[PDB]
Write a protein that binds this ligand. Structure first.
Ligand SMILES: *[C@@H]1O[C@H](CO)[C@@H](O[C@@H]2O[C@H](CO)[C@@H](O)[C@H](O)[C@H]2NC(C)=O)[C@H](O)[C@H]1NC(C)=O
Ligand SMILES: [Cu+2]
Ligand SMILES: [Cu+2]
Ligand SMILES: [Cu+2]
Ligand SMILES: [Cu+2]
Length: 496
């Protein structure tokens, strides 16, 4: 792997991850994007060199490090027009940040329009040399990162505004129904060894039920939060989520199917679609012939807790916080709506507006999309599921924070005692009332949006304008960030 200090060169090229080929987005010349690593505490310096020439997939770029708090470096967060102007083609831009206090499974992806779907997305791992789950396994390396990704034969701006994947990719590889021949990913295990697998959903849209024939999975991490271990059978993982699970390779030397059933496009697994291969050392070089059992024991979010059993911020009762907010989902034009307002990217990034002297949610553009948050306060946000917003279950994501999930989709219980904490949550479906809490530690504007990229493009986002008065003092910006906008605004519309 690469990093924490590395060049990330972005370019256009042809790729063929399901055996069909198309023009996509390459990172340091490879698809899928390379794994980046570091250790708890490291300074990351990722110098992102944009050499893209293809306007249809967007010449400009901007990169988000999904999961990292970025305290003091809000400018390096990534979302285009919230946290920077995009990097311009033929230019470089250095994201220089630290991760004290975090370690786990993370990923990076374009945060400009819907460009991550065209291929600028990869996993990050920050190891803890003192990992409390460490003695549960033998292997934890580049080979144990397992990515899921939806793949489309038409590019995001060429096909439907809300399309359907032709393939699912597992470690970059998988099959579409027209390509029952295409290569399969192979994950290699030695019998009697214990493995930490790090599961990252690189998905622009579908969730996936993930499961490995013949095996059970001991989940120990959610979106970079250490968990009390929780044994399961199958994991329904939503776009942008991550889980670490320990697998003990203690079954008959053989080939077993690894399955990621999407919630749309090609359901079930005929011909090894939505599939990859677990292969014990010494097993024949052949496709698995195993069967899934319906099996029980799925991951249930309301049953997970943090390894440390941390309480929700606030007091144990609905509204027991400094500010309680309710996000009412809706869909007016062909556009998603939160409390009546649809996110359109402002000309001047939200952070620059604040830095240029805007003082309140009311001065911030776009009007109706920005929420002012006070400093050092317990905040509660409820996001009641509704079919009024099509393409639910919507996985909502809060930048700059991990939050307690006080009420998970599919449950009615509220847990203030020891909830799971994570950064991406399924807002479930009619009658759910997913409710989340966090503390306002971290000054700056933080995107809070649906992680279905096509929903984001159609305006399904708000901005948590956190502790506005301390943003400028807390996030001094580097010269290069200040120059992003003047450079980007000078471009012709088809060099964008
Ligand atoms: C740059 O980007 C896009 C998408 O990656 C390319 O669009 C393709 O072009 C033709 C139309 O001319 C189609 O028949 C395809 O289906 C497109 N592929 C994509 C994946 O949808 C395009 O060719 C690119 N331009 C440069 C010249 O390669
Ligand atoms: Cu994020
Ligand atoms: Cu993200
Ligand atoms: Cu959505
Ligand atoms: Cu995001």
């Amino acid at each position: 792997a690469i990093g924490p200090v590395a060049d990330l060169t972005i370019s256009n090229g042809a790729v063929s991850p399901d055996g069909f080929s198309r023009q996509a987005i390459l990172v340091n010349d490879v698809f899928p994007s390379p794994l980046i690593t570091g250790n708890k505490g490291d300074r990351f310096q990722l110098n992102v060199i944009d050499n893209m020439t293809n306007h249809t997939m967007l010449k400009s770029t901007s990169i988000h490090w999904h999961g990292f708090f970025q305290h003091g470096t809000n400018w390096a967060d990534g979302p285009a027009f919230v946290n920077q102007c995009p990097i311009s083609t033929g230019h470089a831009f250095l994201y220089d940040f630290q991760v004290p206090d975090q370690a786990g499974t993370f990923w990076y992806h374009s945060h400009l329009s819907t460009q991550y779907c065209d291929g600028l997305r990869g996993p990050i791992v920050v190891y803890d040399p003192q990992d409390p789950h460490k003695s549960l396994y033998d292997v934890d390396d580049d080979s144990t990162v397992i990515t899921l990704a939806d793949w489309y034969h038409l590019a995001a701006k060429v096909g439907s505004p809300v399309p359907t994947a032709d393939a699912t990719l597992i470690n970059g590889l998988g099959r579409s129904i027209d390509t029952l021949n295409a290569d399969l990913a192979v994950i290699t295990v030695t019998k009697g060894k214990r493995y930490r697998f790090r599961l990252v959903s690189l998905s622009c849209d579908p969730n996936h039920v993930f499961s490995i024939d013949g095996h059970s999975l001991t989940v120990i991490e959610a979106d970079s939060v250490n968990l009390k271990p929780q044994t399961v059978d199958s994991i329904q993982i939503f776009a942008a989520q991550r889980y670490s699970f320990v697998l003990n390779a203690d079954q008959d030397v053989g080939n077993y199917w690894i399955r990621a059933l999407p919630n749309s496009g090609t359901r079930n697994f005929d011909g090894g679609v939505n599939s990859a291969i677990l292969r014990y050392d010494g097993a024949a070089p052949v496709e698995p012939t195993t069967s899934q059992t319906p099996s029980t024991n799925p991951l249930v979010e309301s049953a997970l807790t943090t390894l440390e059993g941390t309480a929700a911020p606030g007091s144990p009762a609905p509204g027991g916080v400094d500010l309680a907010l309710n996000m009412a989902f809706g869909f007016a034009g062909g556009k998603f709506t939160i409390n009546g307002a649809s996110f359109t990217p402002p000309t001047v990034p939200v952070l620059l507006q604040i830095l240029s002297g805007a003082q309140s949610a009311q001065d911030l553009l776009p009007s109706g999309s920005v929420y002012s948050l006070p400093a050092n306060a317990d905040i509660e946000i409820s996001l009641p599921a509704t079919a009024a917003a099509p393409g639910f279950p919507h996985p909502f994501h809060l930048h700059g924070h991990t939050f307690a999930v006080v009420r998970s989709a599919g449950s009615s219980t509220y847990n203030y005692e020891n909830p799971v904490y994570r950064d991406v949550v399924s807002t479930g479906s009619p009658g759910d009332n997913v409710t989340i809490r966090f503390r306002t530690d971290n000054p700056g504007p933080w995107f809070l949006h649906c992680h279905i990229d096509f929903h984001l493009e159609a305006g399904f986002a708000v901005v948590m304008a956190e502790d506005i008065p301390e943003v400028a003092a807390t996030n001094p910006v580097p010269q290069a960030w200040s120059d992003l906008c003047p450079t980007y605004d000078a471009l012709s519309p088809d060099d964008q």
